[PDB]
Symmetry: C3
């Protein structure tokens, strides 16, 4: 399948990005997107 | 609750989208967002 | 590490946002991003 599973998910409030580690290929591919981060 | 849990999370480096399967309703609802994808 | 793990992930089709609860600090920080939501 073209969509691949996420194995780990982290987010960073300095860069305002979330990074998803992917099960694909050699293991070094990530998905990353801009995000808001805040204290509730 | 209006926010619902994600049961599975996949991402696709051809479409540059991540898709989250949701526990809601009949089970066929997803959340989907644009994302970057790259090799580290 | 500056990226921190997500402990829970929910998404909301009224607000069109996904919210990731973060393991950080006092436990009340989230990441949140706009998302599409739809029935497949
Ligand atoms: C002691 C200690 O340590 N403590 C700690 C702390 O520290 C941390 O915190 C952190 O801190 C830091 C330091 O201070 C910081 O940093 C900073 O920042 C800032 C700000 O930022 C922002 O802005 C910017 C600009 O514009 C940008 O870039 C960024 O990015 C940001 O923004 C963001 O972004 C994002 C992404 O894009 C987005 O998202 C999105 O969202 C959306 C929505 O939106 C909204 C709406 O709704 O619309 C908007 C609005 O506005 C809002 N509202 C309000 C009211 O606010 C909303 C809300 O929020 C909601 O709704 C609720 O629900 O939202 C959508 O969702 C989408 O999808 C998304 O995507 C957002 O929005 C944004 N926001 C805003 C507000 O805008 C900055 O600015 C700065 O930078 C500066 O500085 C530096 C140095 O330091 C440098 O490097 C740079 O370059 C800069 O510089 C500058 O420059 C300029 C020009 O160039 C000049 O002019 C000047 O002068 C300079 N300056 C200097 C100084 O140099 C900085 O970076 C940060 O921020 C903080 N963070 C936070 C989060 O807060 C704490 C935390 O931590 C963190 O996180 C965690 C988790 C972990 O990771 C760790 O590690 C980290 O660190 O913690 C504490 N502790 N404890 N517990
Ligand atoms: C052997 C084998 O097979 N191998 C394999 C491979 O293949 C793969 O890869 C893949 O491949 C494919 C094929 O080649 C490709 O495809 C292609 O692509 C291209 C590009 O794309 C891009 O661009 C476009 C346009 O513009 C768009 O649409 C897309 O989307 C993209 O873009 C992107 O997007 C995203 C989303 O929106 C974004 O995100 C974002 O991000 C942001 C940030 O950003 C940034 C910043 O920061 O600012 C930016 C910058 O720039 C950067 N920088 C650099 C330096 O780069 C940054 C960085 O990255 C960072 O920062 C780091 O940290 O970033 C934020 O975050 C936000 O939030 C987000 O959202 C992004 O950004 C973007 N990027 C850019 C760069 O821009 C395209 O173009 C193409 O298309 C074409 O072609 C086709 C056919 O083929 C067709 O269909 C189409 O239509 C087109 O066509 C064309 O048309 C035109 C007009 O219309 C004309 O003119 C021409 O002529 C034509 N042509 C033809 C040929 O026809 C295609 O599609 C892809 O790309 C690739 N991928 C990758 C990822 O790389 C690999 C991988 O795989 C994948 O993934 C995985 C995971 C899984 O899923 C699988 O299954 C898949 O496949 O693999 C390999 N193997 N192994 N190992
Ligand atoms: C019986 C019962 O109960 N049932 C149930 C139901 O109900 C639900 O559903 C829901 O419902 C509700 C009620 O009806 C609704 O609400 C409504 O809505 C509407 C619409 O919204 C939209 O629009 C708006 C405006 O513009 C906005 O704001 C929003 O946000 C939305 O939009 C969206 O957004 C997002 C974010 O930003 C985005 O995303 C993105 O995406 C992208 C992509 O994109 C696209 C592309 O591709 O390009 C686009 C295109 O278009 C598309 N296409 C088509 C064909 O469609 C595509 C596709 O989709 C794909 O591709 C596929 O694959 O896509 C990327 O990805 C990025 O990254 C992202 O981010 C998106 O896009 C968008 N979309 C569109 C389409 O645009 C609205 O409008 C409304 O509002 C109104 O109303 C209210 C009241 O009610 C009020 O408050 C307001 O204010 C408004 O008002 C108005 O105002 C105006 C002015 O101001 C005036 O003029 C008027 O008159 C007024 N009116 C009145 C009435 O007042 C509302 O809000 C919703 O929507 C729904 N949802 C859904 C999801 O559907 C169901 C579901 O549920 C939910 O979800 C779940 C999961 C859970 O959470 C729960 O709890 C919830 O509820 O369910 C059912 N049951 N059962 N089974």
């Amino acid at each position: 399948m073209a969509p691949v599973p996420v194995t780990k998910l982290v987010c960073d409030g300095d860069t305002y990005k979330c990074t998803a580690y992917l099960d694909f290929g050699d293991g070094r591919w990530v998905a990353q997107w801009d995000t808001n981060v805040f204290h509730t």
